[PDB]
Scaffold this active site. Structure first.
Site, PDB file in Angstrom:
ATOM      1  N   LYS A  96      -4.307 -29.069 -32.723  1.00  0.00           N
ATOM      2  CA  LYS A  96      -3.715 -28.000 -33.470  1.00  0.00           C
ATOM      3  C   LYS A  96      -4.573 -27.774 -34.728  1.00  0.00           C
ATOM      4  O   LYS A  96      -4.251 -27.054 -35.443  1.00  0.00           O
ATOM      5  CB  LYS A  96      -2.195 -27.609 -33.419  1.00  0.00           C
ATOM      6  CG  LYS A  96      -1.581 -29.404 -33.280  1.00  0.00           C
ATOM      7  CD  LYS A  96      -0.322 -28.937 -32.740  1.00  0.00           C
ATOM      8  CE  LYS A  96       0.782 -29.841 -34.068  1.00  0.00           C
ATOM      9  NZ  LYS A  96       1.160 -30.251 -35.054  1.00  0.00           N
ATOM     10  N   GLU A 121      -0.461 -24.813 -19.037  1.00  0.00           N
ATOM     11  CA  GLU A 121      -0.541 -25.408 -18.164  1.00  0.00           C
ATOM     12  C   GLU A 121       0.697 -25.987 -17.588  1.00  0.00           C
ATOM     13  O   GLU A 121       0.452 -26.497 -17.664  1.00  0.00           O
ATOM     14  CB  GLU A 121      -1.359 -25.379 -18.390  1.00  0.00           C
ATOM     15  CG  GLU A 121      -1.945 -27.079 -19.265  1.00  0.00           C
ATOM     16  CD  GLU A 121      -1.678 -26.566 -20.518  1.00  0.00           C
ATOM     17  OE1 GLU A 121      -1.726 -24.847 -21.376  1.00  0.00           O
ATOM     18  OE2 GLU A 121      -3.195 -28.259 -21.119  1.00  0.00           O
ATOM     19  N   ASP A 155      -6.162 -21.570 -27.706  1.00  0.00           N
ATOM     20  CA  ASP A 155      -5.617 -21.826 -27.002  1.00  0.00           C
ATOM     21  C   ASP A 155      -4.200 -22.401 -27.936  1.00  0.00           C
ATOM     22  O   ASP A 155      -4.593 -23.127 -28.534  1.00  0.00           O
ATOM     23  CB  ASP A 155      -5.730 -23.002 -25.730  1.00  0.00           C
ATOM     24  CG  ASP A 155      -5.104 -23.207 -24.915  1.00  0.00           C
ATOM     25  OD1 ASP A 155      -4.665 -22.686 -24.325  1.00  0.00           O
ATOM     26  OD2 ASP A 155      -4.842 -24.269 -24.217  1.00  0.00           O
ATOM     27  N   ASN A 156      -3.197 -22.929 -27.112  1.00  0.00           N
ATOM     28  CA  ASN A 156      -1.960 -23.247 -27.684  1.00  0.00           C
ATOM     29  C   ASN A 156      -1.396 -23.074 -28.860  1.00  0.00           C
ATOM     30  O   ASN A 156      -0.812 -23.418 -29.700  1.00  0.00           O
ATOM     31  CB  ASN A 156      -2.072 -24.584 -27.298  1.00  0.00           C
ATOM     32  CG  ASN A 156      -3.392 -25.731 -26.143  1.00  0.00           C
ATOM     33  OD1 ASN A 156      -3.962 -25.905 -26.385  1.00  0.00           O
ATOM     34  ND2 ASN A 156      -2.063 -25.839 -25.188  1.00  0.00           N
ATOM     35  N   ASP A 165      -9.387 -25.459 -28.380  1.00  0.00           N
ATOM     36  CA  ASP A 165      -8.478 -25.937 -27.348  1.00  0.00           C
ATOM     37  C   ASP A 165      -8.563 -27.780 -28.058  1.00  0.00           C
ATOM     38  O   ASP A 165      -8.195 -28.347 -26.709  1.00  0.00           O
ATOM     39  CB  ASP A 165      -8.838 -25.671 -26.343  1.00  0.00           C
ATOM     40  CG  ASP A 165      -7.662 -26.336 -24.927  1.00  0.00           C
ATOM     41  OD1 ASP A 165      -6.574 -26.129 -25.998  1.00  0.00           O
ATOM     42  OD2 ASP A 165      -8.485 -26.061 -24.611  1.00  0.00           O
TER      43      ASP A 165
HETATM   44  N1  LIG Z   1     -11.671 -32.854 -33.954  1.00  0.00           N
HETATM   45  C1  LIG Z   1     -12.106 -32.678 -32.284  1.00  0.00           C
HETATM   46  N2  LIG Z   1     -13.462 -32.640 -31.822  1.00  0.00           N
HETATM   47  C2  LIG Z   1     -13.408 -32.639 -30.867  1.00  0.00           C
HETATM   48  N3  LIG Z   1     -12.936 -33.260 -30.113  1.00  0.00           N
HETATM   49  C3  LIG Z   1     -10.836 -33.157 -30.720  1.00  0.00           C
HETATM   50  C4  LIG Z   1     -11.174 -33.369 -30.789  1.00  0.00           C
HETATM   51  N4  LIG Z   1      -9.922 -33.464 -31.255  1.00  0.00           N
HETATM   52  C5  LIG Z   1      -9.403 -34.010 -30.606  1.00  0.00           C
HETATM   53  N5  LIG Z   1     -10.371 -33.389 -29.491  1.00  0.00           N
HETATM   54  C6  LIG Z   1     -10.439 -33.919 -27.871  1.00  0.00           C
HETATM   55  O1  LIG Z   1      -9.773 -32.689 -27.526  1.00  0.00           O
HETATM   56  C7  LIG Z   1      -9.528 -32.194 -26.501  1.00  0.00           C
HETATM   57  C8  LIG Z   1      -8.351 -31.513 -26.177  1.00  0.00           C
HETATM   58  S1  LIG Z   1      -8.154 -30.886 -24.581  1.00  0.00           S
HETATM   59  C9  LIG Z   1      -8.982 -29.942 -23.733  1.00  0.00           C
HETATM   60  C10 LIG Z   1      -8.377 -28.907 -22.200  1.00  0.00           C
HETATM   61  C11 LIG Z   1     -10.253 -28.016 -22.566  1.00  0.00           C
HETATM   62  N6  LIG Z   1     -10.899 -27.343 -23.065  1.00  0.00           N
HETATM   63  C12 LIG Z   1      -9.462 -27.099 -21.193  1.00  0.00           C
HETATM   64  O2  LIG Z   1      -8.952 -26.618 -21.690  1.00  0.00           O
HETATM   65  O3  LIG Z   1     -10.328 -28.461 -20.066  1.00  0.00           O
HETATM   66  C13 LIG Z   1      -9.668 -33.760 -25.893  1.00  0.00           C
HETATM   67  O4  LIG Z   1     -10.497 -34.598 -24.641  1.00  0.00           O
HETATM   68  C14 LIG Z   1      -9.674 -34.320 -27.630  1.00  0.00           C
HETATM   69  O5  LIG Z   1     -10.265 -35.800 -27.123  1.00  0.00           O
HETATM   70  O1  LIG Z   2      -3.737 -31.365 -27.883  1.00  0.00           O
HETATM   71  C1  LIG Z   2      -3.800 -30.742 -26.799  1.00  0.00           C
HETATM   72  N1  LIG Z   2      -5.331 -30.393 -26.864  1.00  0.00           N
HETATM   73  C2  LIG Z   2      -5.991 -29.331 -26.062  1.00  0.00           C
HETATM   74  N2  LIG Z   2      -4.752 -28.104 -25.606  1.00  0.00           N
HETATM   75  C3  LIG Z   2      -3.627 -29.105 -25.297  1.00  0.00           C
HETATM   76  C4  LIG Z   2      -2.445 -28.342 -24.290  1.00  0.00           C
HETATM   77  O2  LIG Z   2      -3.174 -27.348 -23.628  1.00  0.00           O
HETATM   78  C5  LIG Z   2      -1.460 -28.105 -24.091  1.00  0.00           C
HETATM   79  C6  LIG Z   2      -1.321 -29.232 -24.529  1.00  0.00           C
HETATM   80 BR1  LIG Z   2       1.119 -29.474 -24.410  1.00  0.00          BR
HETATM   81  C7  LIG Z   2      -2.206 -30.802 -26.145  1.00  0.00           C
HETATM   82  C8  LIG Z   2      -2.482 -30.028 -26.048  1.00  0.00           C
HETATM   83 MG   LIG Z   3      -4.863 -26.305 -23.999  1.00  0.00          MG
END
Ligand SMILES: Nc1ncnc2c1ncn2[C@@H]1O[C@H](CSCC[C@H](N)C(=O)O)[C@@H](O)[C@H]1O
Ligand SMILES: O=c1[nH]cnc2c(O)cc(Br)cc12
Ligand SMILES: [Mg+2]
Length: 214
Positions: free
Chosen positions: A142, A197, A167-168, A139
């Site tokens: 992508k 969400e 997710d997603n 998560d």
């Molecule tokens: N290569 C990577 N390694 C670690 N974290 C990363 C990353 N690329 C993006 N992220 C981090 O991934 C997160 C996506 S949002 C995460 C939502 C969380 N799992 C929840 O549901 O509450 C962000 O905080 C972003 O900084």
């Molecule tokens: O970039 C994202 N990382 C992790 N989760 C995500 C999400 O749940 C919705 C959207 Br829009 C973006 C992200």
């Molecule tokens: Mg997500």
């Protein structure tokens, strides 16, 4: 003052300390009514809860922590002894996540890894005493789903029965990852249809009645 800080403050001011359920509920309320944020959220979260209850994993890896919503969601269901490792590339987010876990009383079960997943995954066995993973929550971003899956496999972190949960996969979408795992004899796949969400998106009409020129 950032949106992520406002979320933590809202939790500190409204949630019951040591109560992970109240923590999840305070975040969901703020992000439904005040500010959209990319927490997995309660609809998909209920699915995650059901999957965790099914598999009862001892060692879970999360990719992407954000403000700690999913870490709280998962760690509250873990059995005594079981561990969550969560990877977060943004240091402001890693700090927020730590404070959220502290507030929830879940800090003892969760270890935050600061860094990019692609850099941290090869360090897992040596630095965090990991043999294989029981579950992975993808998560983060992508474009990393598929390459990080291949890295987990390369590094020997997957065993027969390891549950990947992403997710997603539809929005924003992870077409390469989906194609790969669905087409691979190495993975047995199931899709759980739900909703993105916090999508009660406020808009409005303005009526402006012309009164004449000045
Ligand atoms: N290569 C990577 N390694 C670690 N974290 C990363 C990353 N690329 C993006 N992220 C981090 O991934 C997160 C996506 S949002 C995460 C939502 C969380 N799992 C929840 O549901 O509450 C962000 O905080 C972003 O900084
Ligand atoms: O970039 C994202 N990382 C992790 N989760 C995500 C999400 O749940 C919705 C959207 Br829009 C973006 C992200
Ligand atoms: Mg997500």
């Amino acid at each position: 003052d950032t949106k992520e800080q406002r979320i933590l403050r809202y939790v500190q001011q409204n949630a019951k300390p040591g109560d992970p359920q109240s923590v999840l509920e305070a975040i969901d309320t703020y992000c439904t009514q005040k500010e959209w944020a990319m927490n997995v959220g309660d609809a998909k979260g209920q699915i995650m809860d059901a999957v965790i209850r099914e598999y009862s994993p001892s060692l879970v890896l999360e990719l992407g922590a954000y403000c700690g919503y999913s870490a709280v969601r998962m760690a509250r269901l873990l059995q005594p002894g079981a561990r969550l490792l969560t990877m977060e590339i943004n240091p402001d987010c890693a700090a927020i996540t730590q404070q959220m876990l502290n507030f929830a009383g879940l800090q003892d079960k969760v270890t935050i890894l600061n860094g990019a997943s692609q850099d941290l995954i090869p360090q897992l066995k040596k630095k965090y005493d990991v043999d294989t993973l029981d579950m992975v929550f993808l998560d983060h971003w992508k474009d990393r789903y598929l390459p990080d899956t291949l890295l987990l496999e390369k590094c020997g972190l997957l065993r027969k029965g390891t549950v990947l949960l992403a997710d997603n996969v539809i929005v924003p979408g992870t077409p390469d990852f989906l194609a790969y795992v669905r087409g691979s004899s190495s993975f047995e796949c199931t899709h759980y249809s739900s909703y993105l969400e916090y999508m009660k998106v406020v808009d409005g009409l303005e009526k402006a009645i012309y009164q004449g020129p000045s």
